[PDB]
């Protein structure tokens, strides 16, 4: 049960990490792209990518 | 030749009328943008339209 | 290499003029013409443009003109009809080539028209 729970918690943390801003203005890729122009939206895109 | 208020605006990645309608620059532009005043040599007293 | 605009004589209201903008070049058919208007000391404006397939006039000269092309001569010509004394201006004509952006601006012709 520990092994099963460890794997489930690992994948749960991995999926939950997609809700983090990571220093960007938004955690949503579409919201980042649709609120800023492409030339300087790349900074937020790179923050999310890192 | 452009209006005197867009020399800072023609830069790559900068939005504005003259850039996005006449001379849009690529985001990966590598080069030197050079400009100098030409009021005396271009302006006409009757209006250099 | 250059454009010269000649014409714009002395006529009467409602008369017909024939202004030609002969161009020093060899592909001026591709260099579609644009006619511009400047008032005597007031703000500038355009007149017309025979851009190959179709045409486009201005509010002051809407349909009153018969714009013409001389493709066999590489020259442009505007027909002036229903002329008015309030159109006393200096018409221009210009064309920019598709390749290697460049201007061949002319000089201007008077559009003085009497009123009675």
* A abuts C (3+ Cβ pairs < 8 Å): no
DSSP A2: H
CA B41 vs CA B26, B44, C38: distances in Å: 30, 9, 22
Report yes or no on C115 lying in a domain: no
Q: Which residue of B has its CA nearest to C105?
A: B49
- Sign of torsion, CA C95 C101 C107 C110? positive
**Nearest-angstrom CA–CA distance, C85 and C96:** 31
Report yes or no on C59 lying in a domain: yes
Q: Which residue of B has its CA nearest to A41?
A: B13
For C55, the token pair is 């045409």
CB contacts, 8 Å: B13 with chain A: 37, 39-40
Domain boundaries, position C8: 2-110
| Cross-chain residue pair B14–A39, CB shorter than 8 Å | yes
Report yes or no on C46 lying in a domain: yes
State which approach was used to obtain the coordinates: cryo-EM
HEC profile for chain C? CEEEEECCCCECCCCCEEEEEEEECCCCCCCCCEEEEECCCCCEEEEEECCCCCCECCCCCCCCCEEEEECCCCEEEEEECCCCHHHCCEECCECCCCCCCCCCCCCCEECCECCC
Torsion angle in degrees (nearest 10) through CA of C39, C41, C43, C45: 30
State the first-to-last Cα distance of chain A, in angstroms, to the nearest integer: 33
Q: What CATH number corresponds to the domain at position C84?
A: 2.60.40.10
Give the resolution value in Å.
3.0
For C76, the token pair is 């442009």
Report yes or no on C48 lying in a domain: yes
Report yes or no on C116 lying in a domain: no
The domain total for chain C is 1
Report yes or no on C35 lying in a domain: yes
């Amino acid at each position: 049960q520990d092994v099963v729970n460890q794997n489930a918690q690992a994948l749960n943390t991995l999926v939950k990490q997609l809700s983090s801003n990571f220093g960007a203005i938004s955690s949503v890729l579409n919201d980042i792209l649709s609120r800023l122009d492409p030339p300087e939206a790349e900074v937020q895109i790179d923050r999310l990518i890192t | 030749v452009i209006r005197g208020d867009e020399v800072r605006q023609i830069a790559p990645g900068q939005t504005g009328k003259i850039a996005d309608y006449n001379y849009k620059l690529p985001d990966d532009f590598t080069g030197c943008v050079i400009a100098w005043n030409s009021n005396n040599l271009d302006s006409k007293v009757g209006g250099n339209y | 290499v250059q454009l010269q605009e000649s014409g714009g004589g002395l006529v009467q209201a409602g008369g017909s003029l024939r202004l030609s903008c002969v161009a020093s070049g060899r592909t001026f058919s591709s260099l579609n013409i644009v006619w511009f208007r400047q008032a005597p000391g007031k703000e500038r404006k355009f007149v017309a443009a025979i851009n190959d397939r179709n045409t486009a006039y201005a509010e002051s000269v809407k349909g009153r003109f018969t714009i013409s092309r001389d493709n066999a001569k590489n020259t442009v010509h505007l027909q002036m009809n229903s002329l008015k004394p309030e159109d006393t201006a200096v018409y221009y004509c210009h064309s920019a080539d598709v390749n290697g952006g460049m201007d061949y601006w002319g000089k201007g012709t008077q559009v003085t028209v009497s009123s009675h």
